[PDB]
């Protein structure tokens, strides 16, 4: 039971607040309701707290996979967006934030992953995976490494079994096969087998994570870096031209990055429905609102079609949306991320050496057919 007549909105990211706290304000003009904005980063720990007590916002945002979590717990109230946003929602998105073949979820913000090199050092980029360990080798006798992806945990390693196309990459004439079961394939057996042996063949470093990433990146460790595009707000320490390509390849043929879409729910211990109804229909997802939150936020990140008809003018947003359709749109589905968790300890299972590929993968196909 969340206090009536009042609207408070957790919101998720770097930034984007004073965005959104601007278009609450407005909202609080018009309706006289308060608004409350803010960001108790650490929901993992703190939003349990809550959750477990009929508590919390009434409004609040979740990155693509923890969403998953948020509608499992029973905290997702049902959502129902104007008929002409459903319409302006794109079906790879929209269907994205379903569930049960029902409306659940609506998206905020689009972000994707990428290959960011250093430029200056080598402008031509690795071209396949092969090559990765191709520049580790070069720097192996330098005591550095061109590949700084997080090891220790399954963040760039999970979707290292995705990029070869054998695993959660799939397409059938404007859709997604989410049903099937993609870890049984010789494919995703071959990513998880190139991060084990480019481990023993001293390429890669399983014990590497953010932090030391990080650390050797401000320290200046390494003459280059390939890391994720979130990562590059770290790498630009070094003050030196960084590049970007594709970084997974597809049966041979790369197009483009997994593209991780965040979605946001109402709290169902919110009696305030109505007030969450109206924001998010008048204000949230009205194009002049997520200008708003982009003045703060990249604005890549869109929610609406009618909003990404803005987007098309920008030269290098609009070709990014463009070949996001040659990626995968991940899904919030909680169901969908219970199945990424699967081959997320699979992977580490592997690169600890507790065991093998098939062994790795036939139990994260197991926990998925579950």
Do not use: C
Not at 283 to 298: H, I, Q, R, S
């Amino acid at each position: 039971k969340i206090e009536e007549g009042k609207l408070v909105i957790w919101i998720n990211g770097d930034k984007g607040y004073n965005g959104l706290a601007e278009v609450g304000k407005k909202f609080e003009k018009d309706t006289g309701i308060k608004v409350t904005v803010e960001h108790p980063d650490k929901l993992e720990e703190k939003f349990p707290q809550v959750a477990a007590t009929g508590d919390g916002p009434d409004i609040i945002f979740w990155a693509h996979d923890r969403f998953g979590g948020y509608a499992q717990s029973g905290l997702l109230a049902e959502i129902t967006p104007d008929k002409a946003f459903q319409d302006k929602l794109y079906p790879f998105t929209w269907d994205a934030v379903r569930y049960n073949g029902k409306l659940i979820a609506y998206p905020i913000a689009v972000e994707a992953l990428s290959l960011i090199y250093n430029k200056d050092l080598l402008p031509n980029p690795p071209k396949t995976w092969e090559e990765i360990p191709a520049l580790d080798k070069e720097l192996k006798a330098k005591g550095k490494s061109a590949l700084m992806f997080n090891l220790q945990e399954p963040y760039f390693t999970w979707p290292l079994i995705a990029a070869d196309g054998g695993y959660a990459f799939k397409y059938e004439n404007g859709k997604y096969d989410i049903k099937d079961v993609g870890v049984d394939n010789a494919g995703a057996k071959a990513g998880l087998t190139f991060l084990v042996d480019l481990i023993k063949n001293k390429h890669m470093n399983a014990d590497t994570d953010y932090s030391i990433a990080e650390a050797a990146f401000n320290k200046g460790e390494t003459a280059m870096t390939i890391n994720g595009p979130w990562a590059w707000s770290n790498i630009d320490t070094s003050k030196v031209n960084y590049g970007v390509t594709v970084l997974p390849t597809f049966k041979g043929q790369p197009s483009k990055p997994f593209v991780g879409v965040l979605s946001a729910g109402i709290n169902a211990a919110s009696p305030n429905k109505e007030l969450a109804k109206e924001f998010l229909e008048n204000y949230l997802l009205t194009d002049e609102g997520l200008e708003a939150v982009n003045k703060d936020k990249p604005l890549g990140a869109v929610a609406l079609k009618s909003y990404e008809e803005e987007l098309a003018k920008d030269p290098r947003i609009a070709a990014t949306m463009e070949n996001a359709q040659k990626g995968e749109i991940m899904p919030n589905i909680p169901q969908m991320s219970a199945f990424w968790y699967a081959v997320r300890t699979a992977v580490i299972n592997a690169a600890s050496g507790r065991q093998t590929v098939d062994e790795a993968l036939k139990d994260a196909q197991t926990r998925i057919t579950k």
